[PDB]
Amino acid sequence: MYSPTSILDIRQGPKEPFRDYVDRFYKTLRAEQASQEVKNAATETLLVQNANPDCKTILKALGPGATLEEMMTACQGVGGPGHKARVLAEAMSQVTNPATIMIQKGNFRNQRKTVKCFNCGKEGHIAKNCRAPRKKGCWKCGKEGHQMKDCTERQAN
């Protein structure tokens, strides 16, 4: 399941640290590095277009003040994945620019169905924060199986 067409797509999600999603692009790039000529030319526009709107937006904004690793770190944890900074920034942006209603309408095109808690079934929670042995068992290393009670995270995540 966790090896779909998304691996060919590898587009960065707004919560995803740039280099982390680029990491799995790099794992494909290291393999299919036959046409290096097209690959390198692609990666130039590809990785920047691969970013979430906000991410490529900041890249070009802080580019002058961010050499290379700096701009990479800038897009690592955009406003912090679990930080409240991003959540308030989303509200600050919302009142400031009317472009937020446009992307709000565009949100209808986006499958925002990730909110539904992948263990409880409903979107009352978020699976990222909801730690509850409801069903399925081990979602960590087995997904389809393994005892969730004996699944201690060691050299995995």
- Using CB under 5 A as the criterion, which residues of the chain lie in contact with Zn ion when the complex forms? 117, 120, 125, 130, 138, 140-142, 146, 151
Q: Which is nearer to Zn ion, 53 or 121 (CB)?
A: 121
Closest distance to Zn ion from the beta carbon of 138 (Å): 3
Nearer to Zn ion, 9 or 144 (CB): 144
From the CB of 79, what's the least distance to Zn ion, in Å? 24
> Burial letters for 71-106: b for 16+ Cβ neighbours within 10 Å, e otherwise?
beebbbbbbeeeeeebeeeeeeeeeeeeeeeeeeee
In whole angstroms, the minimum distance from the beta carbon of 125 to Zn ion comes to 3
Instruction: List the Cα angle 94/122/88 in 5-degree steps.
Output: 20
Q: Nearer to Zn ion by C-beta: 66 or 151?
A: 151
Residue 133 has which token pair?
A: 């042995």
